[PDB]
Amino acid sequence: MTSEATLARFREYMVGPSRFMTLLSCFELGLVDQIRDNPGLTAAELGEAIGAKADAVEQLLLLLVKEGFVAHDEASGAYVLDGLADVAAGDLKRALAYMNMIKVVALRQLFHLTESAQTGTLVGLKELYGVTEGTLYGAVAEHRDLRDAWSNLMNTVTANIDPWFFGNVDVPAGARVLDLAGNTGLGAIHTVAHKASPGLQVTTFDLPEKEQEALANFKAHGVAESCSFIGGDVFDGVPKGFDIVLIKHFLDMFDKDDVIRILQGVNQALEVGGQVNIMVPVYPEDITDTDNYNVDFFPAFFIGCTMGQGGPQKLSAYQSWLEECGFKVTKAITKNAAEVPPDVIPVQAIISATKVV
Amino acid sequence: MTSEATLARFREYMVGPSRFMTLLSCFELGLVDQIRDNPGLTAAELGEAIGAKADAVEQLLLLLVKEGFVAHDEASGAYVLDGLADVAAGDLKRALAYMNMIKVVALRQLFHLTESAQTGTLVGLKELYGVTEGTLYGAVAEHRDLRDAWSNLMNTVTANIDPWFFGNVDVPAGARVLDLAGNTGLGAIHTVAHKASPGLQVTTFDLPEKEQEALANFKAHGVAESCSFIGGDVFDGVPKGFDIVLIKHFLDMFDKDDVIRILQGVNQALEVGGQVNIMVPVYPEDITDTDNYNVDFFPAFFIGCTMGQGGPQKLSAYQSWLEECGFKVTKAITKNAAEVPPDVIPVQAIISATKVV
Ligand SMILES: Nc1ncnc2c1ncn2[C@@H]1O[C@H](CSCC[C@H](N)C(=O)O)[C@@H](O)[C@H]1O
Ligand SMILES: Nc1ncnc2c1ncn2[C@@H]1O[C@H](CSCC[C@H](N)C(=O)O)[C@@H](O)[C@H]1O
C-alpha cells in the first residue's frame, strides 16, 4: 500500500465528523421533511420554513446534492429528494435512531478516547456529566438524555435481530431461561413470544435500577405470569437454577479477563447438559473484509464511550474461551451482512454451547 | 441513486467520528512512534511502553491493520508499519496538525451544528468556552487551546501557499498595497519579503485591537519603514490611496450580501485601474467531483465551528460578484493538482480583477 494512498485515506478520515453532522443536522433542522413534503422549494423558502438563513440552508444541502441524496435545479434553485426519495420511512427511522445514538453517546466523548485508553476510565462522561467511576450502563439511571438515546437504539437493534436469534436457538417445553444483561426485559418478552410453552419461565438479569421498567414492559406485552426480573451485578454471581442462559450484546463490552469471569459464572449457574446461547458482534477472520464495519466503530465506542475496556473478538476467539470455561460448542453462525439492511453497522454471530465441565 | 446505495452511504457517514479518533488516538497514545522506533513489538510490550492495557492497544490498532497502515503477524502478534512506512516525516506532521485542529475546533462543537445553523451563532463555542458572541477569530485571544490548535496551523499553511500566491500576483515598483483583514501583519511582512522594490508601501487593515501586535511584528521583522497599520471595520469603508488590495482567506467568512458590500467598499477605495487579488477556497463547478473535499468539510466548519455563517463559493460565483461590483477579471486559477499533497482538504483559487466602474 502506497504512501500517497495512505495520505489520501487520512483526508477521508478527516472529513468524518463534518460529514456525519452535516447529514444529521439536515434531518434535525427539518430540511429533509420540508423537501419531501413540499417538492421544489428554494433555499429562501426552506430557510423561512425551518427558521434559518437561506445561505446556511444552501451550504448544508451542498453535501446532500454531492452524494445524490438531494437534487438541485440550477435554473430555478429548486430542491427535490433524489436518493432519499425511495428510502422507506421505516428504514430512515432505523438509520436516524443509530445516528442520534452516536451523536449523544459517542461524538463529544470521542475527544477524550486517548485519556480513556490511558486510564481505563470514561473521561468523556467525566468531562460532560461529572461521572467519576463505572460505565455508561451505570450512569444512565441518573442521565435521561444518555438513557433515552442508548436505550431506544439497543431496543430497536434487538427487535430487528431477535427473530433470527430465536429461529436459530433451541428452547424446549417448560425450560427455565435466564436472559443475562436483559436490560428492561425485551429479550425475555421475545423468548415468550417465539417459545410459548406450558411451564416456560424466563428471567431478565440486569442492574437493579431496571426493575420498575422491566415489570412494566412485562405488563404491557401481557407476559407478567411467565417473565420475572433479578437485579444485580454479573461479577457478584449468575442466578442459579436455569436450563438455558441467553447472552445478547454483552460479551463485546469486556476484555478477555471479564468475559472469562462471566462464562465461569454462567458455568457455575448451570448443570451438566445446560445450554448457553450468545449473540455478539464478531470481527471477521480476515480483518481487511469491507462487508463488516464492526472494527470501524466498536473499539472506539467501548474504550472511549461506554466501558473504558472491551470490544468484539473473532468468532474463533469466543469459541476458544467457551472451551476454556467447560463448554462444548454445538452451533456457530455468522449473519450474512448482505441479508441485513445496508445502514446497519453491527454484524452478529450466534454461538450455542453445552456445559460438560 | 438507489435506496440501497443511500443506506450504505449512511453507514459510511455513521463510522466517520469513530474512524477519525481511532486513527488520531493511535498517534496521540504514541503507538505509531513505538511501532516505527521498535518494529515487531506485541500489544503487551506496546501497552507497557505507552501505559495502557494490551487489550486496548490490540483493539485500537485493528482498524489501522484493516486499512493496511500497519501489519500484524498472526504467529508472533508482532506489529510493524505497512502503508505508514514510506510516508515522509513532514507529510505526517502536516496531516496530524490538521487532524489536531479538527479535534480541537470542530469535533465537540459540531454536536451543536443544528443550533448554530438556527441562531447564526457558534453554540459549540458558547457551550464549551462560555463565548457569548462573535467568531473563532475573536475568541482566540482569551482561549489557549483554540489559539494553539488553529492560530499556529494557519501560519504554517500560510507559509506553504504564500509562495504560490505572490508568484501569481503583479506588484510593480512603488505600489501602495492594502492587505485587507491582514490580522497582525504577517501578510504585509510576506508581501515586503516577496515584492521588495523602491517605494513599496504595504498597510495591514484589520480591527483596532490588532494595531499594537501589528506595529510590533513590523519592528521585529525589520519592515517598520515599509509597513503600517490602519484600524477599522471593512463594512464602515476601505481606506483610500491604494493601487492594489490583497484579500486572502476573508471572503469565505461571509454570505453573498456581505461579500458584495466588501467588494463595493474595495471598489469605492480604488481609482479606475486599481487592482484586487483574492485567494479563497472554491467549490468545483460540478459539485459531484470527488477530488474536491471542500463541501464535505467547510459548510459545517464555517456555520458550526468558526463563523456561524459564510462558506466557500464556486469560482464562477466569485467572478460574477466581481463583475457586478464594477471589476474586470484578468486571472482565475486553481493550484496545480499534482503539486498538492493528497492529505490536504482546501482547494484554493486566486482571482485578480481591475476596477473599470
Ligand atoms: N455489571 C453488569 N451486570 C449486569 N448487567 C450489566 C452490567 N454492566 C452492564 N450491564 C447491562 O448489560 C446490557 C448491555 S446492552 C444489551 C441489552 C440486551 N441483552 C439486548 O441485547 O438488547 C445493559 O442492559 C446493561 O445494563
Ligand atoms: N469587519 C471586519 N473588518 C476588518 N477585519 C475584520 C472584520 N471581521 C473580521 N476581520 C478580521 O478578519 C481576519 C480573518 S483571519 C484570516 C485572514 C488573513 N488575511 C490571513 O490570510 O491569514 C481576522 O484577523 C479578523 O480580525
XYZ file of N, CA and C in Angstrom, chain A residues 1-29 50-53 55-60 62-69 82-84 86-88 91-92 94-96 98-99 102-104 107-108 110-115 117-119 127-128 255-257 283 287-301 303 309-314 337 340-345, chain B residues 1-29 50-53 55-60 62-63 65-69 82-84 86-88 91-92 94-96 98-99 102-104 106-115 117-119 128 255-258 283 287-301 303 309-314 340-345:
654
model
N 0.860 -1.220 0.000
C 0.000 0.000 0.000
C 0.885 1.255 0.000
N 0.557 2.217 -0.868
C 1.389 3.405 -1.202
C 1.333 4.441 -0.071
N 2.320 5.340 -0.032
C 2.371 6.499 0.892
C 1.302 7.521 0.483
N 1.068 7.694 -0.819
C 0.111 8.694 -1.366
C -1.329 8.183 -1.193
N -1.556 6.869 -1.290
C -2.860 6.235 -0.972
C -3.141 6.365 0.536
N -2.115 6.255 1.380
C -2.247 6.393 2.854
C -2.683 7.826 3.168
N -2.019 8.829 2.586
C -2.313 10.261 2.849
C -3.714 10.606 2.322
N -4.131 10.016 1.196
C -5.494 10.145 0.620
C -6.540 9.608 1.612
N -6.292 8.438 2.211
C -7.223 7.796 3.176
C -7.316 8.647 4.455
N -6.237 9.323 4.855
C -6.223 10.269 6.004
C -7.262 11.381 5.787
N -7.341 11.914 4.565
C -8.286 13.004 4.213
C -9.723 12.492 4.360
N -10.012 11.284 3.861
C -11.331 10.613 4.028
C -11.676 10.558 5.526
N -10.699 10.214 6.372
C -10.849 10.130 7.852
C -11.136 11.516 8.432
N -10.456 12.554 7.938
C -10.518 13.935 8.495
C -11.921 14.534 8.343
N -12.648 14.197 7.274
C -13.994 14.786 6.988
C -15.110 13.948 7.633
N -14.782 12.909 8.409
C -15.781 12.065 9.095
C -16.713 12.877 9.996
N -16.181 13.640 10.982
C -17.025 14.455 11.861
C -17.958 15.405 11.096
N -17.410 16.235 10.210
C -18.183 17.255 9.452
C -19.233 16.576 8.554
N -18.902 15.464 7.889
C -19.888 14.713 7.053
C -21.048 14.239 7.937
N -20.723 13.637 9.085
C -21.698 12.961 9.975
C -22.739 13.990 10.429
N -22.279 15.126 10.955
C -23.180 16.176 11.499
C -23.809 17.002 10.364
N -23.158 17.193 9.216
C -23.821 17.911 8.091
C -25.097 17.133 7.737
N -25.007 15.815 7.587
C -26.168 14.969 7.203
C -27.197 14.968 8.342
N -26.771 14.738 9.590
C -27.716 14.601 10.732
C -28.436 15.939 10.947
N -27.725 17.070 10.858
C -28.308 18.423 11.084
C -29.360 18.727 10.007
N -29.157 18.273 8.769
C -30.162 18.406 7.676
C -31.469 17.693 8.045
N -31.411 16.585 8.791
C -32.614 15.896 9.324
C -33.129 16.650 10.559
N -32.247 16.999 11.504
C -32.623 17.683 12.777
C -33.272 19.047 12.485
N -32.758 19.781 11.488
C -33.236 21.134 11.089
C -34.638 21.050 10.472
N -37.890 26.647 8.236
C -37.149 25.943 9.333
C -36.487 26.950 10.290
N -36.576 28.257 10.013
C -36.038 29.325 10.879
C -34.524 29.416 10.808
N -33.971 29.473 9.595
C -32.515 29.589 9.333
C -32.287 30.458 8.094
N -31.144 31.141 8.031
C -30.748 31.968 6.860
C -30.660 31.048 5.630
N -28.774 31.171 3.185
C -27.342 30.994 2.837
C -26.793 29.792 3.621
N -27.189 29.647 4.893
C -26.881 28.482 5.759
C -27.497 27.216 5.155
N -28.764 27.279 4.739
C -29.516 26.138 4.134
C -28.791 25.677 2.862
N -28.477 26.621 1.974
C -27.758 26.376 0.697
C -26.500 25.543 0.981
N -25.646 26.009 1.900
C -24.321 25.402 2.209
C -24.486 23.963 2.700
N -25.370 23.750 3.673
C -25.544 22.448 4.356
C -26.136 21.416 3.389
N -25.469 21.249 0.226
C -24.488 21.017 -0.874
C -23.980 19.575 -0.800
N -23.616 19.107 0.392
C -23.077 17.741 0.581
C -24.145 16.718 0.175
N -25.420 16.960 0.495
C -26.517 16.009 0.164
C -26.712 15.966 -1.363
N -26.489 17.080 -2.074
C -26.511 17.116 -3.569
C -25.289 16.348 -4.091
N -24.108 16.577 -3.513
C -22.850 15.904 -3.933
C -23.024 14.380 -3.877
N -23.667 13.873 -2.818
C -23.856 12.422 -2.542
C -25.030 11.849 -3.349
N -25.866 12.699 -3.951
C -27.021 12.279 -4.768
C -28.247 11.944 -3.925
N -28.258 12.301 -2.632
C -29.439 12.158 -1.739
C -30.513 13.167 -2.143
N -33.718 12.920 -4.112
C -33.175 12.064 -5.199
C -33.001 10.646 -4.630
N -31.818 10.310 -4.106
C -31.572 9.027 -3.419
C -32.568 8.770 -2.298
N -32.862 9.781 -1.473
C -33.744 9.671 -0.277
C -35.213 9.469 -0.675
N -36.801 7.118 -2.482
C -37.293 5.713 -2.432
C -36.857 5.023 -1.130
N -36.300 5.753 -0.159
C -35.984 5.184 1.187
C -37.285 5.155 1.994
N -37.728 3.961 2.391
C -38.933 3.749 3.229
C -38.741 4.479 4.563
N -37.014 2.414 7.255
C -35.543 2.305 7.050
C -34.853 3.588 7.546
N -35.452 4.752 7.292
C -34.861 6.078 7.616
C -34.900 6.297 9.138
N -34.857 3.885 11.429
C -33.808 2.965 11.944
C -32.446 3.673 11.902
N -32.052 4.170 10.727
C -30.746 4.824 10.489
C -30.611 6.067 11.382
N -31.643 6.916 11.436
C -31.618 8.184 12.211
C -31.525 7.888 13.712
N -29.919 5.281 15.045
C -28.491 4.904 15.241
C -27.633 6.179 15.219
N -27.843 7.054 14.230
C -27.093 8.330 14.101
C -27.312 9.183 15.359
N -25.212 7.757 18.216
C -23.774 8.119 18.048
C -23.568 9.575 18.481
N -24.441 10.494 18.053
C -24.311 11.941 18.369
C -24.254 12.123 19.892
N -25.187 11.493 20.609
C -25.407 11.674 22.075
C -24.373 10.863 22.869
N -20.104 11.150 19.976
C -19.454 12.252 19.200
C -18.541 13.102 20.107
N -19.076 13.715 21.168
C -18.273 14.634 22.029
C -17.285 13.809 22.869
N -15.700 11.096 22.293
C -14.578 10.541 21.483
C -13.368 11.468 21.544
N -13.577 12.757 21.820
C -12.496 13.759 22.033
C -11.461 13.217 23.025
N -11.917 12.449 24.015
C -11.099 12.005 25.170
C -10.744 10.511 25.055
N -10.838 9.912 23.859
C -10.503 8.474 23.630
C -9.097 8.183 24.171
N -8.126 9.048 23.879
C -6.705 8.840 24.271
C -6.641 8.656 25.790
N -7.231 9.594 26.527
C -7.187 9.659 28.009
C -7.962 8.459 28.565
N -8.355 5.454 27.019
C -7.463 4.306 26.726
C -6.285 4.273 27.710
N -5.793 5.431 28.156
C -4.659 5.530 29.115
C -5.094 5.151 30.537
N -6.305 5.525 30.970
C -6.766 5.382 32.383
C -7.621 4.117 32.566
N -16.009 14.494 31.882
C -15.925 15.922 31.474
C -17.335 16.484 31.233
N -18.226 15.706 30.600
C -19.564 16.174 30.138
C -20.618 16.065 31.249
N -13.080 -6.998 28.057
C -11.778 -7.693 27.885
C -11.915 -9.169 28.295
N -11.036 -10.020 27.765
C -10.975 -11.489 27.999
C -11.177 -11.794 29.489
N -10.395 -11.158 30.370
C -10.397 -11.482 31.824
C -11.843 -11.445 32.330
N -15.553 -9.651 14.789
C -14.588 -9.325 13.710
C -14.497 -10.534 12.780
N -9.413 -9.451 8.801
C -9.809 -8.110 9.335
C -10.009 -7.093 8.191
N -9.395 -7.296 7.015
C -9.480 -6.353 5.860
C -10.865 -6.395 5.199
N -11.696 -7.405 5.488
C -13.047 -7.572 4.877
C -13.859 -6.278 5.024
N -14.404 -5.786 3.903
C -15.097 -4.480 3.764
C -16.605 -4.656 3.973
N -17.098 -5.898 4.069
C -18.542 -6.191 4.277
C -18.882 -6.172 5.780
N -17.926 -5.838 6.655
C -18.079 -5.919 8.133
C -17.483 -4.648 8.754
N -18.333 -3.767 9.287
C -17.917 -2.434 9.801
C -17.699 -2.475 11.319
N -17.660 -3.661 11.943
C -17.528 -3.792 13.421
C -16.281 -3.037 13.900
N -15.142 -3.201 13.220
C -13.827 -2.645 13.667
C -13.784 -1.119 13.469
N -14.557 -0.575 12.527
C -14.594 0.885 12.223
C -15.342 1.664 13.319
N -16.032 0.973 14.242
C -16.968 1.581 15.222
C -16.662 1.170 16.667
N -16.638 -0.132 16.961
C -16.778 -0.676 18.341
C -15.539 -0.429 19.198
N -14.298 -0.577 18.690
C -13.121 -0.322 19.520
C -13.220 1.036 20.225
N -13.488 2.098 19.456
C -13.611 3.494 19.937
C -14.876 3.654 20.789
N -15.986 3.023 20.380
C -17.297 3.057 21.080
C -17.163 2.497 22.504
N -14.127 1.500 24.281
C -12.965 2.032 25.057
C -13.250 3.482 25.470
N -13.023 -0.257 28.391
C -12.378 -1.557 28.061
C -13.177 -2.209 26.930
N -12.759 -3.399 26.490
C -13.588 -4.329 25.701
C -13.470 -4.135 24.202
N -14.503 -4.553 23.475
C -14.529 -4.599 22.007
C -14.790 -6.023 21.541
N -15.418 -6.226 20.362
C -15.654 -7.571 19.840
C -14.365 -8.388 19.696
N -14.526 -9.667 19.357
C -13.439 -10.628 19.048
C -13.855 -11.404 17.797
N -12.938 -12.159 17.194
C -13.265 -13.157 16.144
C -14.099 -14.273 16.785
N -24.028 -10.242 6.051
C -24.086 -8.758 6.004
C -24.970 -8.265 4.846
N -28.706 -8.114 5.751
C -29.037 -7.007 6.697
C -29.161 -5.712 5.890
N -30.102 -4.797 6.226
C -30.180 -3.505 5.543
C -28.836 -2.778 5.572
N -28.418 -2.131 4.458
C -27.067 -1.574 4.346
C -26.688 -0.429 5.301
N -27.632 0.116 6.072
C -27.343 1.197 7.059
C -26.809 0.603 8.373
N -26.970 -0.708 8.593
C -26.738 -1.351 9.926
C -25.248 -1.671 10.090
N -24.648 -1.197 11.186
C -23.190 -1.344 11.453
C -22.905 -2.753 11.972
N -29.376 7.324 -8.134
C -29.128 6.965 -6.697
C -30.273 6.078 -6.188
N -29.975 4.815 -5.862
C -30.936 3.821 -5.308
C -31.092 4.021 -3.793
N -32.144 3.423 -3.224
C -32.424 3.349 -1.765
C -31.269 2.632 -1.060
N -30.901 1.467 -1.596
C -29.846 0.555 -1.088
C -28.526 1.327 -0.977
N -28.128 2.019 -2.053
C -26.885 2.819 -2.140
C -26.910 3.955 -1.103
N -28.071 4.580 -0.895
C -28.246 5.710 0.059
C -28.005 5.197 1.487
N -28.557 4.035 1.830
C -28.456 3.480 3.201
C -27.008 3.054 3.473
N -26.309 2.497 2.476
C -24.885 2.105 2.581
C -24.032 3.344 2.857
N -24.316 4.459 2.175
C -23.561 5.727 2.352
C -23.809 6.273 3.768
N -25.039 6.167 4.286
C -25.382 6.494 5.702
C -24.461 5.732 6.665
N -24.232 4.434 6.425
C -23.329 3.604 7.270
C -21.918 4.207 7.243
N -21.411 4.568 6.057
C -20.093 5.239 5.859
C -20.027 6.551 6.660
N -21.115 7.320 6.699
C -21.181 8.590 7.470
C -21.144 8.280 8.974
N -21.869 7.252 9.424
C -22.020 6.927 10.873
C -20.667 6.584 11.512
N -19.776 5.882 10.802
C -18.489 5.400 11.395
C -17.415 6.488 11.279
N -17.729 7.643 10.685
C -16.780 8.756 10.497
C -16.142 9.225 11.807
N -16.922 9.616 12.839
C -16.339 10.049 14.114
C -15.467 8.997 14.819
N -15.911 7.731 14.872
C -15.157 6.591 15.460
C -13.874 6.351 14.651
N -13.959 6.315 13.318
C -12.753 6.186 12.450
C -11.782 7.327 12.771
N -12.266 8.574 12.768
C -11.425 9.792 12.903
C -10.581 9.677 14.174
N -11.200 9.413 15.325
C -10.498 9.467 16.644
C -9.689 8.188 16.891
N -10.125 7.026 16.391
C -9.326 5.769 16.460
C -7.936 6.027 15.854
N -7.885 6.601 14.648
C -6.611 6.909 13.947
C -5.828 7.957 14.748
N -6.471 9.049 15.165
C -5.766 10.164 15.848
C -5.221 9.654 17.191
N -6.034 8.918 17.960
C -5.657 8.362 19.288
C -4.451 7.427 19.151
N -4.390 6.613 18.096
C -3.228 5.724 17.828
C -1.939 6.560 17.709
N -2.005 7.779 17.153
C -0.867 8.737 17.100
C -0.681 9.401 18.476
N -1.751 9.941 19.069
C -1.710 10.644 20.387
C -1.152 9.726 21.493
N -1.558 8.449 21.518
C -1.116 7.441 22.525
C 0.397 7.203 22.419
N 3.391 2.569 26.591
C 2.520 3.786 26.482
C 1.645 3.968 27.732
N 1.511 2.947 28.585
C 0.718 3.000 29.834
C -0.763 2.713 29.608
N -1.081 1.691 28.804
C -2.463 1.240 28.508
C -2.493 -0.289 28.470
N -3.659 -0.879 28.730
C -3.860 -2.351 28.683
C -3.529 -2.858 27.273
N -5.013 -5.188 25.798
C -6.348 -5.465 25.204
C -6.837 -4.199 24.480
N -6.542 -3.021 25.035
C -6.863 -1.690 24.468
C -5.999 -1.438 23.229
N -4.684 -1.617 23.354
C -3.720 -1.441 22.227
C -4.178 -2.315 21.054
N -4.464 -3.592 21.316
C -4.894 -4.564 20.279
C -6.103 -3.992 19.530
N -7.146 -3.583 20.261
C -8.459 -3.158 19.701
C -8.264 -1.912 18.829
N -7.496 -0.921 19.287
C -7.359 0.389 18.590
C -6.514 0.244 17.311
N -6.436 -2.497 15.334
C -7.160 -3.387 14.378
C -7.609 -2.596 13.143
N -8.118 -1.367 13.321
C -8.631 -0.515 12.216
C -7.466 -0.108 11.304
N -4.758 -1.906 10.859
C -4.461 -3.160 10.105
C -5.497 -3.328 8.986
N -6.780 -3.082 9.263
C -7.854 -3.183 8.239
C -7.535 -2.263 7.051
N -7.068 -1.032 7.318
C -6.760 -0.013 6.277
C -5.392 -0.300 5.638
N -4.584 -1.172 6.251
C -3.251 -1.559 5.752
C -2.184 -0.526 6.078
N -2.426 0.344 7.068
C -1.454 1.353 7.569
C -0.388 0.661 8.421
N 3.193 -0.516 7.743
C 2.957 -1.006 6.358
C 2.778 0.234 5.466
N 1.541 0.604 5.114
C 1.227 1.856 4.399
C 1.958 3.066 4.974
N 2.061 3.170 6.302
C 2.650 4.347 7.001
C 4.184 4.332 6.925
N 6.447 4.312 4.366
C 7.098 5.197 3.357
C 6.521 6.623 3.405
N 5.615 6.935 4.338
C 5.036 8.308 4.476
C 6.091 9.212 5.129
N 6.469 10.297 4.445
C 7.516 11.254 4.878
C 7.145 11.871 6.234
N 5.146 15.118 5.801
C 3.749 14.882 5.344
C 2.875 14.513 6.550
N 3.348 13.585 7.395
C 2.613 13.105 8.599
C 2.369 14.273 9.558
N 2.079 17.472 8.905
C 1.044 18.352 8.306
C -0.335 17.718 8.537
N -0.510 16.454 8.142
C -1.765 15.685 8.324
C -2.197 15.734 9.799
N -1.298 15.404 10.729
C -1.608 15.280 12.182
C -1.998 16.643 12.760
N -3.458 19.149 11.072
C -4.816 19.439 10.554
C -5.842 18.600 11.331
N -5.564 17.310 11.534
C -6.432 16.409 12.341
C -6.564 16.978 13.762
N -8.966 19.897 13.738
C -10.368 19.391 13.616
C -10.832 18.859 14.982
N -9.977 18.130 15.695
C -10.292 17.589 17.045
C -10.660 18.749 17.986
N -9.896 19.843 17.963
C -9.989 20.943 18.977
C -11.079 21.944 18.572
N -13.578 21.541 15.894
C -14.797 21.030 15.215
C -15.458 19.883 15.989
N -14.702 18.916 16.516
C -15.277 17.593 16.879
C -16.458 17.772 17.846
N -16.260 18.442 18.983
C -17.317 18.577 20.031
C -18.341 19.638 19.611
N -17.866 20.745 19.037
C -18.697 21.910 18.639
C -19.772 21.463 17.634
N -19.469 20.492 16.759
C -20.394 20.051 15.674
C -21.641 19.395 16.277
N -21.561 18.892 17.516
C -22.731 18.424 18.304
C -23.879 19.437 18.191
N -23.545 20.731 18.149
C -24.499 21.872 18.193
C -24.646 22.550 16.824
N -24.299 21.872 15.727
C -24.396 22.453 14.357
C -25.836 22.899 14.090
N -26.831 22.096 14.466
C -28.258 22.413 14.194
C -28.592 23.757 14.858
N -28.212 23.899 16.125
C -28.491 25.097 16.956
C -27.684 26.267 16.385
N -26.786 26.637 13.234
C -27.480 26.987 11.965
C -28.768 27.794 12.222
N -29.502 27.502 13.301
C -30.808 28.156 13.608
C -30.597 29.606 14.076
N -29.558 29.854 14.884
C -29.312 31.133 15.605
C -28.305 32.017 14.855
N -18.947 25.298 25.416
C -17.646 24.753 25.907
C -16.752 25.840 26.518
N -21.535 35.660 3.836
C -22.578 35.312 2.836
C -22.553 36.375 1.731
N -23.098 36.035 0.561
C -23.140 36.877 -0.670
C -23.305 38.360 -0.316
N -24.423 38.732 0.317
C -24.821 40.156 0.503
C -23.651 40.912 1.144
N -23.016 40.313 2.155
C -21.836 40.880 2.857
C -20.604 40.843 1.941
N -15.668 25.853 -4.330
C -16.416 24.630 -4.703
C -16.190 24.405 -6.196
N -20.448 19.887 -8.625
C -20.358 19.728 -7.142
C -20.206 18.236 -6.775
N -20.477 17.312 -7.713
C -20.337 15.839 -7.525
C -18.863 15.398 -7.563
N -17.941 16.242 -8.050
C -16.482 15.945 -8.163
C -15.920 15.457 -6.821
N -15.109 14.393 -6.840
C -14.601 13.681 -5.632
C -13.159 14.093 -5.312
N -12.472 14.792 -6.219
C -11.103 15.322 -5.962
C -11.204 16.512 -4.989
N -12.360 17.186 -4.930
C -12.560 18.418 -4.119
C -13.393 18.080 -2.872
N -12.768 18.137 -1.686
C -13.363 17.730 -0.382
C -13.949 18.941 0.359
N -14.020 20.099 -0.306
C -14.419 21.397 0.301
C -15.849 21.289 0.845
N -16.775 20.666 0.109
C -18.206 20.568 0.518
C -18.356 19.567 1.680
N -17.485 18.552 1.780
C -17.518 17.529 2.863
C -17.138 18.175 4.205
N -16.468 19.326 4.162
C -15.809 19.929 5.342
C -16.387 21.313 5.673
N -16.400 22.250 4.719
C -16.462 23.706 5.010
C -17.852 24.174 5.448
N -18.978 23.713 4.846
C -20.301 24.132 5.308
C -20.438 24.014 6.837
N -20.111 22.847 7.393
C -20.212 22.536 8.838
C -19.161 23.331 9.621
N -17.950 23.464 9.080
C -16.808 24.160 9.727
C -17.103 25.651 9.901
N -20.261 27.357 9.460
C -21.572 27.555 10.137
C -21.478 27.096 11.600
N -21.748 31.490 9.991
C -22.191 31.986 8.661
C -21.108 31.669 7.622
N -21.343 32.067 6.369
C -20.340 32.044 5.295
C -20.156 30.653 4.714
N -18.957 30.400 4.197
C -18.620 29.196 3.424
C -18.070 29.551 2.042
N -17.304 28.628 1.424
C -16.801 28.834 0.068
C -17.922 29.024 -0.962
N -17.536 29.419 -2.170
C -18.442 29.522 -3.346
C -17.734 28.883 -4.542
N -18.462 28.599 -5.620
C -17.841 28.291 -6.933
C -17.028 29.517 -7.377
N -0.233 19.444 -5.022
C -0.970 19.445 -3.721
C -0.942 18.039 -3.125
N -0.370 17.855 -1.913
C -0.395 16.555 -1.239
C -1.810 16.000 -1.075
N -2.018 14.666 -1.151
C -3.372 14.107 -1.124
C -4.073 14.175 0.248
N -3.379 14.583 1.318
C -3.995 14.744 2.666
C -4.675 16.112 2.803
N -4.381 17.070 1.918
C -4.825 18.492 2.051
C -6.279 18.605 1.581
N -7.144 19.174 2.422
C -8.603 19.342 2.133
C -8.821 20.566 1.244
